[PDB]
Amino acid sequence: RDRRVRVAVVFGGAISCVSAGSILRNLDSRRFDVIAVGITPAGSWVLTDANVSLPPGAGEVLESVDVVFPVLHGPYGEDGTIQGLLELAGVPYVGAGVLASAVGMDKEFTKKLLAADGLPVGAYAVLRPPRSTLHRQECERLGLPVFVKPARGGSSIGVSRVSSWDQLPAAVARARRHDPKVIVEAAISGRELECGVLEMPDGTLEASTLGEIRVAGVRGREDSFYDFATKYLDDAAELDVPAKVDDQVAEAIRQLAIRAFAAIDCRGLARVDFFLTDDGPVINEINTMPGFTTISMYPRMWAASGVDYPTLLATMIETTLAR
Amino acid sequence: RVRVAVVFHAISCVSAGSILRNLDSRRFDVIAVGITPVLESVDVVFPVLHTIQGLLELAGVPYVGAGVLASAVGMDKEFTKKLLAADGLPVGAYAVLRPPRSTLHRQECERLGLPVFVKPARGGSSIGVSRVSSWDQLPAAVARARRHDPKVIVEAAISGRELECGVLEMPDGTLEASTLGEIRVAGVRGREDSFYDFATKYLDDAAELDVPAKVDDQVAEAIRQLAIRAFAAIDCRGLARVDFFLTDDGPVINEINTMPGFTTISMYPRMWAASGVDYPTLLATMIETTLARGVGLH
């Protein structure tokens, strides 16, 4: 119709193509006028069968649409790069935004903001150069083992399981190869539960039914060493959606997810990664770039909550246009 | 000679002016820029305006100042109070309203008390701000603020003597706090309040300044220490002006400004001059420090 919202699904020339495919097939063509844009390795915007200084082809594409639906993923994982371009071009797009993503990308800032709002996070310390060592009081507070990680990074690169304090220095140097700022986290374990948060056009935040992942077979309990996304790629992962959990606890966790979203001033969407510990729920991650394949955890959780993919996608578009 | 570029609402033009005349020419090659009068050809940039940061970050060029996240935090009243309270620093009570919510919960009212100041969470503290002395006035105040920012902060009024402190990042990474500077508008001794932001009050003709502030030594020392911690609490770089109110219950932090005025008569340069650091030395130091750090993750 001559009234349909015009949408560009923009993705990188694998998961990104499959995600783009999933989005393309589930956008209601009665409602949206949709085109498909692949970004070449070199960074040119090339149109593909949908079934200031901007990149080659990007100018012409952007003027022809009202909203961009970007696939924030690349060969190395989550990739929010394009968000900055779109912010600069003044084009509305589905995404958490530059600022929330920068926050979400930094474990220190994320944990700081979460805790500031009274949300449960695992105990940890932060080491900046030259600091490669911890105070005795910090050691007692953290216990062992600790997981040493670059504050900013992905896919669990530069991450070490430290099992005696003597191992810390080497672990810090390893993490420091990737980020000068290094986080020493108390190990967290229990059941790993996900919750997807969705922002409605009026700002109302809705939380999905919980999804559970298990990748530790014999051990019976998950821990926070690997990130959820990495675990999700394990051939041995088992997912329960919905997760089999007390209704009261599920409700409490969903409320926490909502609060986590607000805590970092997120926009649009996020996946919140919880561990159900002996001492209760702990937030291990809030991820601002959830997956968009039809078998990704975010869409599955929402489907289990009664919200089909076409409705989910339409809502995200409606929310970003309202904003 | 280190090549330097100064980029620059209306106070940005003036600031940029002082900087040009004061950068030791024998030490630096300088290029002023709103536009001439790309590249590169420059080894450091001195931003005096405005995202501008993220752009320079994306350019891999070293620049003076807090930059991306820290800049965002200092501009966001909610983020500021969050992160400050995180490190155990004293801030005023507040509540935040995000759409679709406009009405405070009873527990928020309980904690806030009256009067409160309603403000857009972002931007200056001049536009869309209201003083609310009774709850029935709150809805209209929120509607006013929300015209300027969807996120609205409701703040307990803070009152007392207003004191500023400039933090400076040295090349070796140590942080130094300037002597205190006091400001007074309004008729009284205390009776300064957190309604308007420092910057606005600093432009008022009525404004009286004491630099150094006449304050007890133990109190001044503690405030300067709180200022260092505030700077670190938001992961700031290079410099900041921290705005305090000395209340009946002790100092309270109201603002961390990551882009203070840079005229020779601005508060930040004034505080440092009163601390034994003249304007030329201050600027050279800032350039020194930013060369020594980046670019890259920090």
**3-class DSSP string for chain A:** CCCCEEEEEEEECCHHHHHHHHHHHHCCCCCEEEEEEEECCCCCEEEECCCCCCCCCHHHHHHCCCEEEECCEECCEECCHHHHHHHHHCCCECCCCHHHHHHHHEHHHHHHHHHHCCCCCCCEEEECCCCCCCCHHHHHHHCCCEEEEECECCCCCCCEEECCHHHHHHHHHHHHCCCCCEEEEECCEEEEEEEEEEECCCCCEEECCCEEEECCCCCCCEECCCCHHHHHCCCCCEEECCCCCCHHHHHHHHHHHHHHHHHCCCCCEEEEEEEEECCEEEEEEEECCCCCCCCCHHHHHHHHCCCCHHHHHHHHHHHHHHC
- Whether residue B130 is annotated as binding a ligand: the answer is yes
Strand order of the β-sheet with B2-7 is B28-33, B2-7, B44-47
Residues in B lying within 8 Å of A, measured between beta carbons: 51, 54, 58, 68-69, 72, 76, 78-79, 82-83, 85-86, 98-101, 150-151, 235, 296-298
Method: X-ray
* Chain B: closest CA distance from residue A101 (Å): 11
CA distance B209 to chain A (A): 35
What type of residue is B121?
A
Q: Scanning every residue of chain B, which has its alpha carbon at the shortest distance from the alpha carbon of A152?
A: B297
Kind of pairing, strands B2-7 and B44-47? parallel
d(CA A288, CA A264): 10
End-to-end Cα, chain B, rounded Å: 26
Rg (C-alpha) for chain B, rounded Å, is 19
Instruction: Please answer whether residues B268 and B239 qualify as being in contact, where contact means their C-beta atoms are separated by less than 8 angstroms.
Output: yes
Task: Yes or no: say if B258 and B236 are a contact pair by the CB < 8 Å rule.
Answer: yes
**All domains of chain A, ordered by start, with CATH?**
1-94+308-323 (3.40.50.20), 95-121+188-307 (3.30.470.20), 122-187 (3.30.1490.20)
**B265, amino acid identity:** I
A177/B83 Cα distance (integer angstroms): 27
Q: Could you tell me whether strands A280-287 and A222-223 are parallel, antiparallel, or unpaired per DSSP bridges?
A: unpaired
d(CA B249, CA A236): 58
Please list, in sequence order, all residues whose beta carbon lies within 8 angstroms of the beta carbon of residue B86, skipping any fewer than 6 positions away: A112, A113, A115, A116, B233
Q: Is the peptide bond before A222 cis (omega within 30 degrees of 0)?
A: no
Residues of chain B with C-beta less than 8 angstroms from the C-beta of A87: 51
Q: How far apart are the first and last CA of chain A?
A: 23
With beta carbons less than 8 A apart as the criterion, state whether A92 and A322 touch.
no
As a three-state string, the secondary structure of B243-278 is EEEEECCEEEEEEEECCCCCCCCCHHHHHHHCCCCC
Q: Which residues of A touch B78 (CB under 8 A)?
A: 265
Nearest to A34 by CA among A310, A323, A322: A310
Among the listed residues B164, B155, B141, the one whose alpha carbon sits nearest the alpha carbon of residue B223 = B164
Q: Closest CB to B69: pick one of A87, A103, A202.
A: A103
Contacts for B199 with CB less than 8 Å, ≥ 6 apart: B124, B257, B261
CB-CB contact of B9 with B49 (8 Å): yes
- Beta-carbon separation of B297 and A106 below 8 A: no
Structure tokens at A138: 């910090």
Taking a C-beta distance cutoff of 8 angstroms, is the pair B255, B164 a contact?
A: no
The tally of CA atoms less than 13 A away on the side-chain side of residue A63 is 4
Return the residue of A nearest to B173 by Cα. Answer: A129
Of the partner residues B58, B83, B235, the one whose CB lies closest to the CB of residue A116: B83
Say whether B100 and A152 touch across the interface (CB within 8 A): no
**Residue B20 class from Cβ within 10 Å (0-12 exposed, 13-18 middle, 19+ buried)?**
middle
Measure the CA–CA gap between A126 and B142, rounded to whole angstroms: 38
A203 chain-B contacts, CB cut-off 8 A: 98-101, 150
Written as six digits, the tokens of A64 are: 């022809």
Q: Which of A109, A113, A203 sits opposite B98 (nearest CB)?
A: A203
Q: Burial code of B44-68, b = ≥16 C-beta within 10 A, e = fewer?
A: bbbbbeeebbbbbbeeebbbbbbbb
Inter-chain touch B83–A112, beta carbons under 8 Å: yes
Q: Whole-angstrom Cα distance, residue B138 to residue B116?
A: 9
CA distance B169 to chain A (A): 16
d(CA A178, CA B234): 22
Inter-chain touch A102–B69, beta carbons under 8 Å: yes
For residue A106 the two structure tokens come to 């930094």
Among the listed residues B96, B113, B200, B81, the one whose alpha carbon sits nearest the alpha carbon of residue B149: B96
As given in the structure block, the two tokens for residue A110 are: 């994320």
What is the dihedral sign for C-alpha B189, B194, B198, B201? negative
Record: contact A113-B83, CB cut-off 8 A: yes
Q: Is the dihedral of CA A42, A45, A49, A50 positive or negative?
A: positive
Contact B86 A116 (CB under 8 A): yes
Cβ–Cβ under 8 Å, residues A288 and A196: no
Is B58 in contact with A84 (Cβ distance < 8 A)? yes
Both structure tokens of B249: 């219950």
Query: In angstroms, how far apart are the furthest CA atoms of chain A?
Result: 68
CB contact under 8 A, A109 and B69: yes
